[PDB]
Amino acid sequence: VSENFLEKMMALYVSSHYKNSPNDLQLMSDAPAHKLFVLLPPIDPKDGGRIPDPLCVIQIALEGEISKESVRNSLSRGQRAGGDLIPWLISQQFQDEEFASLSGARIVRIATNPEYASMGYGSRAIELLRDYFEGKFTDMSEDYSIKRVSDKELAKTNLLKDDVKLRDAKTLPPLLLKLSEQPPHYLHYLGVSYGLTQSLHKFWKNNSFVPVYLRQTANDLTGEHTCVMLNVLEGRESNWLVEFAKDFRKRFLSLLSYDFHKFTAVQALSVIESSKKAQDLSDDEKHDNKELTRTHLDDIFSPFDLKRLDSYSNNLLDYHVIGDMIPMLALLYFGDKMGDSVKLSSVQSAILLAIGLQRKNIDTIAKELNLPSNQTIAMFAKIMRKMSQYFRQLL
Amino acid sequence: GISRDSRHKRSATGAKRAQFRKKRKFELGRQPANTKIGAKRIHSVRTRGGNKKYRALRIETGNFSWASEGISKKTRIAGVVYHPSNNELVRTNTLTKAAIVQIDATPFRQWFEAHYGQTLRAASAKIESSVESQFSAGRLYACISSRPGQSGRCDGYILEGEELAFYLRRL
Amino acid sequence: QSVQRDASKGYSILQQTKLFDNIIDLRIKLQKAVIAANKLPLTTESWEEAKMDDSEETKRLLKENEKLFNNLFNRLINFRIKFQLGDHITQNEEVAKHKLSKKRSLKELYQETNSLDSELKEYRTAVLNKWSTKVSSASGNAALSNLPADVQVENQLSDMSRLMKRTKLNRRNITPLYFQKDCANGRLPELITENPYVFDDEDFYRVLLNDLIDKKISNAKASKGRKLNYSVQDPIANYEAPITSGYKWSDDQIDEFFAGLLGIQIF
Amino acid sequence: MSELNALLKDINGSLTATSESLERLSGIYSNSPAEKVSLLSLKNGSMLGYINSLLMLIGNRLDDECKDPSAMDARERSIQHRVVLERGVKPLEKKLAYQLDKLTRAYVKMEKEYK
Amino acid sequence: VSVYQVSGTNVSRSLPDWIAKKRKRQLKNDLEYQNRVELIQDFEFSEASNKIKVSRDGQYCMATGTYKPQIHVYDFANLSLKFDRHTDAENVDFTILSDDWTKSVHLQNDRSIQFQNKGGLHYTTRIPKFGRSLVYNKVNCDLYVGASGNELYRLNLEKGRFLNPFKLDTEGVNHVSINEVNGLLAAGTETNVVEFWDPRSRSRVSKLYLENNIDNRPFQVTTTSFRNDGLTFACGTSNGYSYIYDLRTSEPSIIKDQGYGFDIKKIIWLDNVGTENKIVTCDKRIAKIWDRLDGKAYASMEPSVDINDIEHVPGTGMFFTANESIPMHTYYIPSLGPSPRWCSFLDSITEELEEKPVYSNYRFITRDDVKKLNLTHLVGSRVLRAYMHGFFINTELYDKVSLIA
């Protein structure tokens, strides 16, 4: 029965990954930190004990709880310890030692039946899995260890006479345990590591996951960039995530030119949106975006530039004359310095990010967004007309 | 495409006639005007000769006459309730002649109160009990006596007596 | 088979919720009694003066008044003994039946009220400790080892003076009958707006109403074509050609989705 | 009419209403192996004592003697019963609220299935 | 969000449009008239428009008229009327089988189905009884027609023969819709139930009884629409509620009402535009965009005159609406998506347009309903706001009240 269930799980676990089949089985069995969760359909009592198929398979790896002393030593030495990918990676990028001490779980793999994809089973499993660790599956009813073979027994057995037998079924626990039965390990955050794609990003976005890190150097085999998203469970401090999310967003905006210029304007926009959702996560106003000051504006743009920007809004200029102001305007808007006064549509947001940050040419965006070049300029002019009016209002 | 010619029909004996000629303009028909309650909208049609026909494509108000009291008032039409020919016309609130509609009782009530000085001499003010109940409700059953598809008007008369009893039974 | 135990527990959980609504309804009916009771006199002289206003009618009302409480509260204590018996709150099964059978006086009824509370206090300590341990273990707080709920109750009972003052608060501004006369005559030692004698549970009463309201919200002939002819129609024959690809979903998926349409120990 | 007479009439109407409801409530309970959740059972018992404390406060006031018009003993019982409902039970049931809903939803589906 | 009315009637409902045109000629001197922009010439029917649909090709549009009952086909590239074709009776509904305007099936109100081709009326047939809706399956080549009778008549275009008509348990079918991904079909009975049928077999998969704990009054399923995903289903109740259902469950995920109390006519899922979780629901009075998951109102399109039907050009922000007025209103919502390719520079002139604007968010109670609902006390308070004959109210509060009463 265990083998029959094991093969079914491996069908899902091996359903979609790129050829790294063999070693994972040893990791799953022998690694102590790893745990397995399976989503199952409703069990009809009339079934007669027939095992239902698995709809979703989740493998988690408990990570963190690293002593601060080791982190500073390892960080100074530049040596990476085996395991604990997320605790080490965020510490290296953010130079934060408090994060490593935090206890967290990485969702190494989530698999769903390909036939049933997009039906919401995967999102349900993550919802329940988060619910399990939060403590909400409390027992409603008013031991699962297995005794090891003693050293005395090993010495007293002879190789010729040895009876190599499967362990008695009575001793073994049940294969599937209700979430209430087994108490969860206390955790601070849930993490995911994956190559960034539109479908995967939208899935994690809808599950309240926040990006914290994106690797600049694309993976050679896939061409995708590794992205690490975190989510904070209720009842635990959430400030550290918000600080990381703000830092990542600022880092992302500058790196759109260097190495993420290939990312589509829509995909880059969604990454910014998902990070901003972390700002909504924290009700605290201690950390908030600061509206642009008059003194800051004067430092950024000279009066001539504002006149140069204003005339374009009146259509008295050519588009090339204002090319120099575009990237600075993009940083302010996506930095949220402009404030509630200026807001833009999804298409307008994509266009502004592309020229300002991706550095792509106008005709390229016309192709990417399937728009005429004339519309994109017309949309683009409308963006500065709103911006020009805001600068007038500040003055 | 609409024609009133009798040539396409089978003869009295049942023989299948052949097409004697192409359709003529002196035997034409025009598409029906499905009048419906709404803001007044009437379309003029130039007919044979200089005569013109008015197409009540939409109409909401009409001159209804109280025969027993021998008066007439202009009232709004609430909705169609029963039409003898086809029930789907009642379903779609289509206005044509003989349709039973519900009309506002406000002008008739005000006139009765003014003329007889009695809320709705005593003997004259007496009226049929069912009609009194309809005023108490606030709407009156009326039968349209005009043809909105021809004259562009939706005049009518309030049901009374055996007429009202019959249509109440049918309702 | 475990599904059946879930149902009985599900049936069980509903019973209290209905019972919870019913007892709150009992409180709602008693609400006007508490308000009117707070308006009653406070001293012997005021009560005698109140009777003097209408001696005969007041005496008749007082007699009908007194009987109903003895009947009502005696029935309430019987319910309490039965209720604490069925739920295993009281362990002495024989003693509970003996109390139920016997008829009890006002002084005796008071003694049962004290005894029932003391038993409920003991059941309180066991129940709160038990569930608090379960919740703590379920949430990993056991692994961590936010006060125990029983401890929190004990601490708040220790702060009796603060919550004592809360009840003294006269939010409704109730003036008991002949209050000014008793104040002038010095017949009210406690006083010599917060009134020790006026009892106010309006905020608690409103909260119970709000909880009750929210739960209710949350839970809630052949001619003219009148007969159909199936003969082939040449003009519309071969008007359109079918798509051989079929629906995007597989047939097995379609068959299953329609099927569910509109709703070693292995475990 | 004297103020007391109108007041006493209001109390009389309240009791016959409460007693009749108590008659109904006692009947259904007697109408009701099914094992009961302890937490809500105490929560039921706790407010019942609170109602008794309110009624005991009422009874103390009504006595023409009015030896204890403040109703100190009645109040303290109400204080104890009110405290457990607000501070002790409510955090626990909130932590337990989801799993309660799941079982109640679980039966409701079954009852519809049985019908 | 902002809604720009590119064309239509800018006058109020009380003002008659035809006299306004007779006053419009007098004020032709006013400069704004000369500077007006008309997207499509002759985009106005003589009296009113019954239905409007956009060809799947994305380069053509078709519409039906009142008097003389006529069919207008518009070419986007030429921004004008390609042709007008008269008919013998008014059109209850129609569909465009081909990607272009070439082949279309029209259901008239005289109990007759008319097949229109490039040259003209290819063929006309009569169904047993009056019809109310129409749909066609590409896979089966079978045209499914509802009717007053309980049967749902089936016509096969490939074989050119009527086939065995599906027998609905209830009498009457107000609307029928078919899902592309599944093939599942639904029918809207007069009673508060939707009967789902399978086209692969000839069977009733199941029936869903619409439950309205708010209002206990009778209602009918006026409109049904299946989402592109196929697991979601929308209904339109005559009382004025539209239900969103996930087909797997048997309960309504969200029940959003327009509030005026009029019937729901058209329901469109704006998946293509982006942020797929948006839906359209159209009364005679108003059409509202609100979020699928949370039921929050995005924007509102309220024409002065009644709406007979609303259509949305795929991938774009524009909405065409068939109305009772002489013009056919068309609305542009820039936030939802870009303007279509054919009218590229409409975005450039956004300032000139009307920029028309609370009604969508809140519910509306009639005076009789206020008295029945025991909300006379709410009258004169901030909670209840007067709107002409009746008073608006919050949606959640009204739901709680109707439970109380």
PDB file of C-alpha atoms in Angstrom, chain A residues 161-242:
ATOM      1  CA  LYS A 161      20.301 -16.865   9.574  1.00  0.00           C
ATOM      2  CA  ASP A 162      19.229 -13.208   9.348  1.00  0.00           C
ATOM      3  CA  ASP A 163      15.493 -12.719   8.774  1.00  0.00           C
ATOM      4  CA  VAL A 164      15.241  -9.582   6.627  1.00  0.00           C
ATOM      5  CA  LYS A 165      11.519  -8.856   6.905  1.00  0.00           C
ATOM      6  CA  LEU A 166       9.280  -5.856   6.397  1.00  0.00           C
ATOM      7  CA  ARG A 167       8.482  -4.129   9.678  1.00  0.00           C
ATOM      8  CA  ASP A 168       5.336  -5.415  11.368  1.00  0.00           C
ATOM      9  CA  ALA A 169       2.322  -3.361  10.318  1.00  0.00           C
ATOM     10  CA  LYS A 170       1.172  -2.934  13.927  1.00  0.00           C
ATOM     11  CA  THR A 171       4.256  -0.934  14.925  1.00  0.00           C
ATOM     12  CA  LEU A 172       4.162   1.448  11.966  1.00  0.00           C
ATOM     13  CA  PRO A 173       2.030   4.617  12.180  1.00  0.00           C
ATOM     14  CA  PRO A 174      -0.702   5.419   9.651  1.00  0.00           C
ATOM     15  CA  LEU A 175       0.430   6.569   6.219  1.00  0.00           C
ATOM     16  CA  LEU A 176      -1.792   9.673   6.170  1.00  0.00           C
ATOM     17  CA  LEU A 177      -2.130  11.823   9.289  1.00  0.00           C
ATOM     18  CA  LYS A 178      -4.832  14.416   9.854  1.00  0.00           C
ATOM     19  CA  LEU A 179      -3.505  17.947  10.263  1.00  0.00           C
ATOM     20  CA  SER A 180      -4.998  18.079  13.765  1.00  0.00           C
ATOM     21  CA  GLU A 181      -3.216  14.894  14.855  1.00  0.00           C
ATOM     22  CA  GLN A 182       0.369  16.121  14.399  1.00  0.00           C
ATOM     23  CA  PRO A 183       1.331  19.481  15.969  1.00  0.00           C
ATOM     24  CA  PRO A 184       3.024  21.902  13.550  1.00  0.00           C
ATOM     25  CA  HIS A 185       6.475  23.337  14.055  1.00  0.00           C
ATOM     26  CA  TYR A 186       6.379  27.016  14.986  1.00  0.00           C
ATOM     27  CA  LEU A 187       7.360  29.061  11.920  1.00  0.00           C
ATOM     28  CA  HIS A 188       7.854  32.736  11.097  1.00  0.00           C
ATOM     29  CA  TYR A 189       7.694  32.755   7.283  1.00  0.00           C
ATOM     30  CA  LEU A 190       6.995  30.579   4.247  1.00  0.00           C
ATOM     31  CA  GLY A 191       9.371  30.716   1.296  1.00  0.00           C
ATOM     32  CA  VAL A 192       9.417  29.613  -2.333  1.00  0.00           C
ATOM     33  CA  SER A 193      12.323  29.388  -4.789  1.00  0.00           C
ATOM     34  CA  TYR A 194      11.614  29.125  -8.511  1.00  0.00           C
ATOM     35  CA  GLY A 195      12.460  30.460 -11.941  1.00  0.00           C
ATOM     36  CA  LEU A 196      10.424  33.573 -12.681  1.00  0.00           C
ATOM     37  CA  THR A 197       7.589  33.054 -15.175  1.00  0.00           C
ATOM     38  CA  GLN A 198       4.283  34.800 -15.813  1.00  0.00           C
ATOM     39  CA  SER A 199       2.127  31.844 -14.754  1.00  0.00           C
ATOM     40  CA  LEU A 200       4.120  31.005 -11.623  1.00  0.00           C
ATOM     41  CA  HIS A 201       4.337  34.652 -10.551  1.00  0.00           C
ATOM     42  CA  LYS A 202       0.566  35.095 -10.804  1.00  0.00           C
ATOM     43  CA  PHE A 203       0.009  31.904  -8.801  1.00  0.00           C
ATOM     44  CA  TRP A 204       2.259  33.030  -5.947  1.00  0.00           C
ATOM     45  CA  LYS A 205       0.921  36.589  -6.171  1.00  0.00           C
ATOM     46  CA  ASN A 206      -2.639  35.400  -5.528  1.00  0.00           C
ATOM     47  CA  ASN A 207      -1.353  33.390  -2.536  1.00  0.00           C
ATOM     48  CA  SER A 208      -0.093  36.516  -0.700  1.00  0.00           C
ATOM     49  CA  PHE A 209       3.598  35.856  -1.408  1.00  0.00           C
ATOM     50  CA  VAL A 210       5.955  38.848  -1.609  1.00  0.00           C
ATOM     51  CA  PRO A 211       9.211  38.978  -3.640  1.00  0.00           C
ATOM     52  CA  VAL A 212      12.402  39.599  -1.672  1.00  0.00           C
ATOM     53  CA  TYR A 213      15.156  38.676  -4.136  1.00  0.00           C
ATOM     54  CA  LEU A 214      15.680  38.127  -7.861  1.00  0.00           C
ATOM     55  CA  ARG A 215      18.925  36.747  -9.275  1.00  0.00           C
ATOM     56  CA  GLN A 216      20.442  38.903 -12.002  1.00  0.00           C
ATOM     57  CA  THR A 217      22.328  36.084 -13.738  1.00  0.00           C
ATOM     58  CA  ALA A 218      19.856  33.894 -15.603  1.00  0.00           C
ATOM     59  CA  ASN A 219      20.057  30.146 -15.093  1.00  0.00           C
ATOM     60  CA  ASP A 220      21.902  28.627 -18.043  1.00  0.00           C
ATOM     61  CA  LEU A 221      19.683  25.577 -18.553  1.00  0.00           C
ATOM     62  CA  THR A 222      16.322  27.384 -18.473  1.00  0.00           C
ATOM     63  CA  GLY A 223      17.135  31.046 -19.102  1.00  0.00           C
ATOM     64  CA  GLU A 224      14.883  31.964 -16.161  1.00  0.00           C
ATOM     65  CA  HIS A 225      15.912  34.096 -13.192  1.00  0.00           C
ATOM     66  CA  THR A 226      15.663  32.623  -9.706  1.00  0.00           C
ATOM     67  CA  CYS A 227      13.137  34.495  -7.561  1.00  0.00           C
ATOM     68  CA  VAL A 228      12.562  34.056  -3.826  1.00  0.00           C
ATOM     69  CA  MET A 229       9.205  35.079  -2.356  1.00  0.00           C
ATOM     70  CA  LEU A 230       8.296  35.129   1.334  1.00  0.00           C
ATOM     71  CA  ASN A 231       5.006  35.304   3.222  1.00  0.00           C
ATOM     72  CA  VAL A 232       4.574  36.078   6.919  1.00  0.00           C
ATOM     73  CA  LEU A 233       2.148  34.009   8.966  1.00  0.00           C
ATOM     74  CA  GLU A 234      -0.248  35.817  11.277  1.00  0.00           C
ATOM     75  CA  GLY A 235       0.900  36.301  14.853  1.00  0.00           C
ATOM     76  CA  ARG A 236       4.530  36.979  13.879  1.00  0.00           C
ATOM     77  CA  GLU A 237       6.377  40.241  13.324  1.00  0.00           C
ATOM     78  CA  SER A 238       5.984  41.432   9.730  1.00  0.00           C
ATOM     79  CA  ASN A 239       8.206  44.536   9.759  1.00  0.00           C
ATOM     80  CA  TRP A 240      11.308  42.771   8.436  1.00  0.00           C
ATOM     81  CA  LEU A 241       9.498  41.579   5.303  1.00  0.00           C
ATOM     82  CA  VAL A 242       8.222  45.073   4.481  1.00  0.00           C
TER      83      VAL A 242
END
